[PDB]
Design a protein around this nucleic acid. Structure first.
Lengths: 63, 60, 77
RNA sequence: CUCCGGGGAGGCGGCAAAUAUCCUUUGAUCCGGAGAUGUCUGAAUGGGGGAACCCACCUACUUUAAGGUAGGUAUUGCAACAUGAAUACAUAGUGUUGCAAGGCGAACGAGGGGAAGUGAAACAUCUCAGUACCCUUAGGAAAAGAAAUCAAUUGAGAUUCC
RNA sequence: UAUAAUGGGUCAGCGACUUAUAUUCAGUAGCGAGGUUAACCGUAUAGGGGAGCCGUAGAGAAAUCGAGUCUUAAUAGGGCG
RNA sequence: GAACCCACUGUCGUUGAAAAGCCAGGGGAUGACUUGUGGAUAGGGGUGAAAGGCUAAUCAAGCCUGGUGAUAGCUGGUUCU
RNA sequence: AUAGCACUCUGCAAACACGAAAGUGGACGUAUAGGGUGUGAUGCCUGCCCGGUGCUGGAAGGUUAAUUGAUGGGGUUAGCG
RNA sequence: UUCUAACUCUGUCCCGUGAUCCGGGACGAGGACCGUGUCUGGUGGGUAGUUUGACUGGGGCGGUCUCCUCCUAAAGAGUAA
RNA sequence: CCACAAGUCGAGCAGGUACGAAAGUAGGUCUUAGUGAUCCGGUGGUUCUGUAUGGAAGGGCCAUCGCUCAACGGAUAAAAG
């Protein structure tokens, strides 16, 4: 039948003009011990690596 | 339940009083034996309408 | 069978649900029992197998009305 | 086997030849329609029973010996009628007459119950799946159906299927 | 692996990468900033049917803006375009 | 101590005369005995003077049909140039 | 396994077992009876321990469920502004 | 603590009836207890589904499993037991 | 530096600041260990969202809290022979 999206991956990735964007890890908790530079540099979105792009494409066929 | 007394009872009342009793009392002792009747509009109207005078004359 | 003559209630099925959310088949049973009612118009005692909700309906509507209704459905009482 | 219609030189079903006897232009064999007959077991229904068997009763006629023919004799539900306890009225019960039902069969429908193997790369929530299976019961289809329904520019207008 | 590791006594016949749907890439054909109909109707491979889908615009969690947009006090810097 | 019921030792038999036997010896043999006919108990159940024994040559969960083409990160096989 | 021995349960609609229930066995029996457990004719006998687990009898102090719902804190709007 | 009227009787008598089932009637003994439905705490190998790591000079037992410094490490980086 | 996820160094620009007369120095400590992804929730803010509409509940964004998940890339919230 129709291909089905992996909803867990759909909640983690979004599509840009030429690729996919994602959030950065290690910013959920245990934040007091982290330096200010890590705190502000782990904030925001980055791009999905070319090695994982193919897997993301198989997991999210319509985005 | 709500019951009107056809015949006098020691403490519930005397000769036609309406009063509230527990369900089991009326269901198992009064209504089968004919010492009372439930407080429906039809039964109550029949109580005052015709049989009131006959019941009063049948005091004993 | 465990059927109420006045309301038609009967056992139903359901689940036991544990704290770990294990599910097991179970039954819910009616509060059934036998009771004798004085039928004045016939001067006799009538024995019925019914629930407590059936008793509440009998208190609300009168025994003779319920008996006529049951006889209207082909029940031999 | 009988009647009606069709047909016009052969036919007596097949394995399976031949023989023999026959039938047929006074209409055969054969084809279509309507009737007649229709043993025993089987829901099996007079009782019973190891299916195709054993044993009976009643009525009408008939025979003269130890019988024959025809019909009837199940249960349950409903209706009428009769009768009828403990118990006085009644009721329960009992019986007769009439009507109806039971069983079988492919799938599809509706309802009552309802798994596990497996997947999760283990497994208990979860999945498999209201599937397999069991039970009850319709019809040519069933179920649903004419808003105490949706919508959100104040609009649509019963149910079902794509 | 001659292996003293596995399988086969011999012959003849049969015996194992399929089908449906979705998606991506490569060829090839039509049309081309456009392309294409589904169910359905249809003396039925035609002809009708434009609902819908893909392309033509991105940024941002979003409201919002838009060849820009987000972040920020910032028109600076930087990220996606 | 014969019939009858058992099964302690040994030879033979082991593609047997026999899917548990023959031969020579052995135990009980009026009893908690042996046996015929007809019945009852049905599978997580039955029955068991108890060995996990027996329940149709099958038992640490009988047989048959369905779920079912169960699953197998394992072994084998996979056909012309 | 056994006769013998001991412990323990059971006052009769018995304990106990089968069954979903109705009911059935126990038993048409009644503590000299019936069920469970261990030991095993007979002779001589059978020592110490109640801290653990179990069973039996107490206590009404601590803790604790359903149910009940006292107070307190938010949302909304009459009105004041 | 009394009472009877729900309810109980695997107690006696009568009828249906040719009947140790059952139903109705009359008594007697109990009695708002016992018992059943829904909710709720405790107990619960009686029964059911499952889990119970890897490295390793075989496996088990022992030890180890993440991070930092030096040597092995062959004058860039990296490099096993 | 690196499979990824991560990790490390950093001149310089804007705002506020401390210490110096000043040029200036300061985004923790001579350095290299002192650690734990995601999910689910708690707390403080917020020009985001708010299922008819106005609110609100809930959700989003920014900051931060709860693991000897030590079998330390962490199969379950929950497991021995």
């Amino acid at each position: 039948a129709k291909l089905k999206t992996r909803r867990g991956a759909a909640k983690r990735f979004k599509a840009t003009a030429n690729g996919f964007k994602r959030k950065q890890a290690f910013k959920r908790h245990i934040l007091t011990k982290k330096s200010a530079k890590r705190i502000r540099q782990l904030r925001g979105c980055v791009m999905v690596h070319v090695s994982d792009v193919a897997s993301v494409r198989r997991m999210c066929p319509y985005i | 339940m709500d019951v009107i007394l056809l015949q006098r009872i020691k403490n519930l009342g005397k000769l036609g009083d309406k009063v509230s009793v527990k369900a089991g009392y009326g269901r198992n002792f009064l209504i089968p034996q004919g010492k009372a009747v439930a407080a429906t509009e039809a039964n109550t109207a029949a109580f005052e309408a015709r049989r009131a005078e006959l019941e009063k004359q049948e005091a004993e | 069978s465990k059927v109420c003559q006045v309301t038609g209630k009967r056992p139903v099925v359901g689940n036991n649900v544990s704290h770990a959310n294990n599910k097991t088949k179970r039954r819910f049973e009616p509060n059934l029992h036998h009771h004798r009612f004085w039928l004045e118009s016939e001067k006799r005692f009538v024995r019925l197998r019914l629930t407590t909700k059936g008793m509440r309906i009998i208190d609300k509507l009168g025994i003779e009305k319920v008996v006529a209704d049951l006889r209207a459905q082909g029940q031999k009482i």
